[PDB]
Design a protein around this nucleic acid. Structure first.
Ligand SMILES: [K+]
Ligand SMILES: [Mg+2]
Ligand SMILES: [Mg+2]
Ligand SMILES: [Mg+2]
Ligand SMILES: [Mg+2]
Length: 170
RNA sequence: AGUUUGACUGGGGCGGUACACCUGUCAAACGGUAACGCAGGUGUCCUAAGGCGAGCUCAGGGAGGACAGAAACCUCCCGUG
């Protein structure tokens, strides 16, 4: 009934880890993303100086990576397994894309190394349909259109159908 | 001993600089147009903040995401500036 070009699918998984300050902590956090994603992470500087958070401007504060393709799908199932395939409905967003956070990186895949820290990580998957790339395109870029957009309700079905997930009322 | 001891100025002095400049206004829809008219600014700064090319999009807001809270970072959407 539905067109094959309307099928929902994962655009990117967008792992992010934010630490307080630049230092060995950030470098070891970068290795944490590198081992999980098999991919070189990128550091993010602080936009402003905040004395309360003890961060200075243009200081490396966080490390983040974007994972696409089958690699993203395999990372998502590990993280969902940490949350026992149970996502709260507030986590799903109005734009049609959801995210969850994992407190401990060590539990899934990677053995703890004494050099490596105890860092957790942040998941935010972006859900898309075929043809969403027209917005990114340089030539003749355009908006996707209302019917082709993904709603919060559609994302919730996708989790409930693909991962037999449970959306708790929270 | 010789000489000098600025100017403008609702008298002079004191105070200010309207004494060389720049923006808006006055200013009466070309331009020009005065008051010690009004609101301000200048004696600098920059091997890049100069010159090309390329690639991006900004302020702000909404919705999401471990520690994270009104603000740390990540993601999507709106966004004529
Ligand atoms: K005029
Ligand atoms: Mg005189
Ligand atoms: Mg005239
Ligand atoms: Mg005129
Ligand atoms: Mg250009």
């Amino acid at each position: 009934k539905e067109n094959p070009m309307r099928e929902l699918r994962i655009r990117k998984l967008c792992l992010n880890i934010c630490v307080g300050e630049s230092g060995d902590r950030l470098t070891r956090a970068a290795k944490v993303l590198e081992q999980l994603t098999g991919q070189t992470p990128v550091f993010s500087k602080a936009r402003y100086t905040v004395r309360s958070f003890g961060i200075r401007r243009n200081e490396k504060i966080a490390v983040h990576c974007t994972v696409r393709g089958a690699k993203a799908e395999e990372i998502l199932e590990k993280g969902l397994k940490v949350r026992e395939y149970e996502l709260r409905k507030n986590n799903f967003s109005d734009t049609g894309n959801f995210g969850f956070g994992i407190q401990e990186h060590i539990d899934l895949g990677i053995k703890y190394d004494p050099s490596i820290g105890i860092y957790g990580l942040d998941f935010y998957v972006v859900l898309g349909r075929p043809g969403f790339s027209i917005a990114d395109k340089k030539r003749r870029t355009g908006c996707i259109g209302a019917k082709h957009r993904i709603s919060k309700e559609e994302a919730m079905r996708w989790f409930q159908q693909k991962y037999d997930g449970i959306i708790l009322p929270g």
